[PDB]
Amino acid sequence: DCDPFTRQYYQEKFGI
Amino acid sequence: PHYIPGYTGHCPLLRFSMGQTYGQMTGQLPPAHRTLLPLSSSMVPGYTGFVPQAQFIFAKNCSQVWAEALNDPRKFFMSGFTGYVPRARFLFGSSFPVLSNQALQEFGVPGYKFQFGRTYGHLTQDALG
Amino acid sequence: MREIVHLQAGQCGNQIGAKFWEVISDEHGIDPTGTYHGDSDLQLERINVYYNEATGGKYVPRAVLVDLEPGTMDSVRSGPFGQIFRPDNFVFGQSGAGNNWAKGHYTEGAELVDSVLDVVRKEAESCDCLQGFQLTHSLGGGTGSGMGTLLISKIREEYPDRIMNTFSVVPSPKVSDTVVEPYNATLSVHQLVENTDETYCIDNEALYDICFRTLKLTTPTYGDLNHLVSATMSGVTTCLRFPGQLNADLRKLAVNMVPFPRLHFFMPGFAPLTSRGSQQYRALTVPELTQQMFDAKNMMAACDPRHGRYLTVAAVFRGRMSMKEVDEQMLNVQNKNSSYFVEWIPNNVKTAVCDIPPRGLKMSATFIGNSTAIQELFKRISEQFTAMFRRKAFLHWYTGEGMDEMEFTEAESNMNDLVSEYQQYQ
Amino acid sequence: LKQFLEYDRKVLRFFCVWDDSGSVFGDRRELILHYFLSDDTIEIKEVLPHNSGRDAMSLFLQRRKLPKYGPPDQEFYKDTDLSIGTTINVWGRKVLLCDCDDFTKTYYRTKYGIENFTSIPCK
Amino acid sequence: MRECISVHVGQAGVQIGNACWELYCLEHGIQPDGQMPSDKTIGGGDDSFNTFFSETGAGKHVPRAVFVDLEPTVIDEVRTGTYRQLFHPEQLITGKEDAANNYARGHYTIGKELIDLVLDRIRKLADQCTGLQGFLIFHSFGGGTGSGFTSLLMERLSVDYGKKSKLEFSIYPAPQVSTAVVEPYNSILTTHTTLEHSDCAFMVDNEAIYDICRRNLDIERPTYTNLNRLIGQIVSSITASLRFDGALNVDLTEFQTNLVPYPRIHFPLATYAPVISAEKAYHEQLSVAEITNACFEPANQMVKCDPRHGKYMACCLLYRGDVVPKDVNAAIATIKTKRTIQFVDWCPTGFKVGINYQPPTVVPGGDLAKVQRAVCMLSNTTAIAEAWARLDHKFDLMYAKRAFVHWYVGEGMEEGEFSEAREDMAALEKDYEEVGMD
Numbered sequence A: 001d002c003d004p005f006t007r008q009y010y011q012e013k014f015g016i
Numbered sequence B: 001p002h003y004i005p006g007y008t009g010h011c012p013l014l015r016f017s018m019g020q021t022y023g024q025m026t027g028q029l030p031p032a033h034r035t036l037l038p039l040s041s042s043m044v045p046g047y048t049g050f051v052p053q054a055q056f057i058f059a060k061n062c063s064q065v066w067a068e069a070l071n072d073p074r075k076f077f078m079s080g081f082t083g084y085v086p087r088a089r090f091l092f093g094s095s096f097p098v099l100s101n102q103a104l105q106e107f108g109v110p111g112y113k114f115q116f117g118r119t120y121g122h123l124t125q126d127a128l129g
Numbered sequence C: 001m002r003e004i005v006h007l008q009a010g011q012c013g014n015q016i017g018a019k020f021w022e023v024i025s026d027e028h029g030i031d032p033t034g035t036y037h038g039d040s041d042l043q044l045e046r047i048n049v050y051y052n053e054a055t056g057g058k059y060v061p062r063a064v065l066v067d068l069e070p071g072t073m074d075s076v077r078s079g080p081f082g083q084i085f086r087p088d089n090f091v092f093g094q095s096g097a098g099n100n101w102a103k104g105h106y107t108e109g110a111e112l113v114d115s116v117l118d119v120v121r122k123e124a125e126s127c128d129c130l131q132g133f134q135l136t137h138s139l140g141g142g143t144g145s146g147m148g149t150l151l152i153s154k155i156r157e158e159y160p161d162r163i164m165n166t167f168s169v170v171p172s173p174k175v176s177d178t179v180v181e182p183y184n185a186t187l188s189v190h191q192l193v194e195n196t197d198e199t200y201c202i203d204n205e206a207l208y209d210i211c212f213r214t215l216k217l218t219t220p221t222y223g224d225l226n227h228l229v230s231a232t233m234s235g236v237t238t239c240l241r242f243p244g245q246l247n248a249d250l251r252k253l254a255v256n257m258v259p260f261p262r263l264h265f266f267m268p269g270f271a272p273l274t275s276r277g278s279q280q281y282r283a284l285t286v287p288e289l290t291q292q293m294f295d296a297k298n299m300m301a302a303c304d305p306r307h308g309r310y311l312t313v314a315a316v317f318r319g320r321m322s323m324k325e326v327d328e329q330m331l332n333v334q335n336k337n338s339s340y341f342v343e344w345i346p347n348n349v350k351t352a353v354c355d356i357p358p359r360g361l362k363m364s365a366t367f368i369g370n371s372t373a374i375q376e377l378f379k380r381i382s383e384q385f386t387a388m389f390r391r392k393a394f395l396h397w398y399t400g401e402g403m404d405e406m407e408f409t410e411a412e413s414n415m416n417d418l419v420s421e422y423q424q425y426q
Numbered sequence D: 001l002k003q004f005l006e007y008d009r010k011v012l013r014f015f016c017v018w019d020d021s022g023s024v025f026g027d028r029r030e031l032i033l034h035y036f037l038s039d040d041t042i043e044i045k046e047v048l049p050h051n052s053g054r055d056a057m058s059l060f061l062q063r064r065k066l067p068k069y070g071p072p073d074q075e076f077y078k079d080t081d082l083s084i085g086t087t088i089n090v091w092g093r094k095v096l097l098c099d100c101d102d103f104t105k106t107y108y109r110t111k112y113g114i115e116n117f118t119s120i121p122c123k
Numbered sequence E: 001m002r003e004c005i006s007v008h009v010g011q012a013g014v015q016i017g018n019a020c021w022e023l024y025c026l027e028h029g030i031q032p033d034g035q036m037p038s039d040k041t042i043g044g045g046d047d048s049f050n051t052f053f054s055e056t057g058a059g060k061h062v063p064r065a066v067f068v069d070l071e072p073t074v075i076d077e078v079r080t081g082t083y084r085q086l087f088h089p090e091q092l093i094t095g096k097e098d099a100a101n102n103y104a105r106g107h108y109t110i111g112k113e114l115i116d117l118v119l120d121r122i123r124k125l126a127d128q129c130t131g132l133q134g135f136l137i138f139h140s141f142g143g144g145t146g147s148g149f150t151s152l153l154m155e156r157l158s159v160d161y162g163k164k165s166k167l168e169f170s171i172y173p174a175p176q177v178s179t180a181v182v183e184p185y186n187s188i189l190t191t192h193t194t195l196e197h198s199d200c201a202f203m204v205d206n207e208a209i210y211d212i213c214r215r216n217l218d219i220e221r222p223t224y225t226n227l228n229r230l231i232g233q234i235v236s237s238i239t240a241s242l243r244f245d246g247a248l249n250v251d252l253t254e255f256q257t258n259l260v261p262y263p264r265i266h267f268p269l270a271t272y273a274p275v276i277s278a279e280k281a282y283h284e285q286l287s288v289a290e291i292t293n294a295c296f297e298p299a300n301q302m303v304k305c306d307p308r309h310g311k312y313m314a315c316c317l318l319y320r321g322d323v324v325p326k327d328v329n330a331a332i333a334t335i336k337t338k339r340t341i342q343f344v345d346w347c348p349t350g351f352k353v354g355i356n357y358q359p360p361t362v363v364p365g366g367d368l369a370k371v372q373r374a375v376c377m378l379s380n381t382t383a384i385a386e387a388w389a390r391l392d393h394k395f396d397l398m399y400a401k402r403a404f405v406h407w408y409v410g411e412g413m414e415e416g417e418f419s420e421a422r423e424d425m426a427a428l429e430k431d432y433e434e435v436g437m438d
Ligand SMILES: Nc1nc2c(ncn2[C@@H]2O[C@H](COP(=O)(O)OP(=O)(O)OP(=O)(O)O)[C@@H](O)[C@H]2O)c(=O)[nH]1
Pocket: C245, C246, C252, E010, E011, E012, E013, E015, E016, E069, E071, E098, E099, E100, E101, E102, E139, E140, E141, E142, E143, E144, E145, E146, E147, E171, E178, E179, E180, E206, E224, E225, E227, E228
């Protein structure tokens, strides 16, 4: 799991 | 687009401001603003005749001067508050956080003679309803 | 949470404070029917300091209003903010003062002191935490020196350890309305020095000079004189009512400027003063306020301060301002006028700073100063006394009221003693 | 000077009524208003009942030019600003005009000509 | 577990603390509402939030300090201020009246009507602390609730916790600029109830910080908020090891083993280093050399006292940031050449360095920029004597004409005390002149 910041960081850097 | 710290001179409304750096109190505060700063091939330069508007300008060659010429939660108050709350010394009902809370919202058997022979609880049912 | 009490006596004292009670009523935003309509919130946590609460939101002025003759109370209740005053606090007799100190102090006064102390200690005991006893009166009158001197004598013997400041109106040198002014002044000055341990007294002439030169009004009535002397007394207590970063409360504004226990005669003043037509042409800047605070013309000066030397000075400020300027500039006032501030005291000026500006301005200040030049304010009354006592002009009225001549000279001997320590520090 | 001589002893006696029922504690108050036409100053007196709980003082508002809206473009009240059927804002207090002296009626007939004068008394 | 009780007492202290817990919270990612940032992260470890906070059961971490000022004005601005629903409802003891700037109202009258609860709370807090490392006091040195209440505690405290470090953060009177007129009195009277009850005196001025706000940070006309946050950061820089990881780590105990030499000589003047704006910042090379060949310069000392007409003795060089251990050695090596940073003959060593690894934090909306390093040269020099000589000389010049002594020995005291202070002070001076003596 991750916090509600790594999920945001991953959808505007690596396009998840 | 701020003023550099070494800059002396005049910037408007600097005298009434305080507590901020010279690049922030200037950047927070005219259309033509330039202070901050945000044919030639058909004639050879030896020519000595006349072309209009060609006796005026520098910053560029003669062969270029004929170019330019042509072109409600969180309402409570916590313990021991030595301020004044309206309706604090008057009313009551709960704790000082709730006292300061409620004070802010308010800022803005008959006929028993003729009962004979029927049960007393059943008598009060007739009196109540 | 820390409350103040204001006292009104005399015709002059009643009219000043009635103009003073409206200045804070629209400073704290209290409507002149009794309710409250303030803009911000910060003027509600300290509303008990100078007022107090009643049922229905109908806020109450905490003041006592006393005079022998009920003529001026008929005007206060008829005024703009006179429907807030509590008629329990309206204690009055039936006869006039007569502009003399005999029918104000010992005989007429003695049958009202019980009636007035009963309502003063009514509110003083219902107070959560008393702080001070402000009083506004006129020295050259029959009631201000008459009964405004009993109360300050009968409060101090009952509250011996509380600060209390007074707002006297000393008679002017060359313009006067009565011809009995030094009789009502010298006999007060001995008593005023003995127990007030703080005064605030500037004549009527200096109020005329400020309204003619600093403010430039052609026809100044008593209104703007009372407004201006009310402005210098709404900023003296501003640290008790508004927050700040470096503030001065009243007892804090007492030991900082009373160097000797009977050396307590001060000199008020209001900083942001300008003409009616020169508002937009003037930079309301704190280096320029204090050039105007430290003169004789735009500051409330009954006597010229350059004729003496400043012994200890206050400067309470109001409004959002920088502390570095006011620290460096009081340093600049000190060294430029080192010949007019005393030696043997390294720091001379208090720097008090508030957080919230007054109504109508963005910064303000109030000049409060002990000057040795105030000795000339008492020379002229003494010079007037010995020019009229030596003929025994009006000693028969005082003799007729059962009052002796033996301590009639004890008042002058002590104000001659009083000024002697003033002249010790030339 | 020209207004002092023209309307020296011409006083406009305007009977009035004030109610405070929005407050928790209050009574229906009846007021008397005098308007000097010499210098346009409004003076308000108070008349009390036979056993009123209020102290019997003389005046309610002193001899002054009364401001237009609330507590203070310094616009003030004038004679044409108020009439019968309108409410005046006397220092944040809503006071309705009910009756007038007959001399003021004769004053109003000569200048504009208001007729039939439907007075609205309270009880 | 290395908790640290910081007692801020007074108008000043409360201010130099309402702007100290801000960064004491910012660094350890603490939300201005207890529950910490609960949606992201900031990297601090569920341990660094203990040096100055106390985890409850819902994250409502609470400040480990005590703010006591008689008048309620200031602490009321905290009760109703940006920082609330966090400061303990009782860690903010509210008094009644003020102090007038007369020591007495802090060491005789009202001064006593509150120490019963104030001392109580500081102990009530000691319970949770399983290692109170010291008592950092934050008050003025020229007021009433600053010298009074503090003095009372200072001694009172020692007679209950004793064995401990009493480092103090004070706003000493400035040479020329000054507010209250009886400052040279309420000050000479507190250097007699601290010189034998408090250890290191991290003393700070007002004129000096003001000149630095213009000569370096370029803020003509600064205020107290501008001054408090800088003094506030000196505090954080000192209490760095107790919370942040690093190489050489200096502790509150070590801050008084390589610092104060002889018992009484404990007057260190502090010196933050990367005091710079943002315009002249991302341009200059903040080098461990410059950030050091500046903390030893005269115009950068926060206590007006030429650091050249005297003799340094001990000098901690706390180094928060990306300071590799090497540069530090050479930096101090340069300092030892400069034939001007004169030294005495008793301290051949001299500098204690703490290269902690945690770059400074920027208080949202401030002059300080995002520098990646900082020094705090807290040093004991013998020129802090020219900071007393003045206050002292003044006392006499004024006491001569027994000025402002009535309302002093009146609320409770003893005229004699005045005289005794002057004596104790003459000694402090006598010893300083005999300490720097070869
Ligand atoms: N750096 C800084 N110094 C301050 C601040 N406020 C006050 N001071 C200093 O404190 C000195 C006066 O002492 P205070 O702490 O303000 O007064 P006090 O201890 O509360 O005593 P009283 O004023 O009688 O209540 C002044 O000379 C100022 O230099 C501040 O916000 N920041």
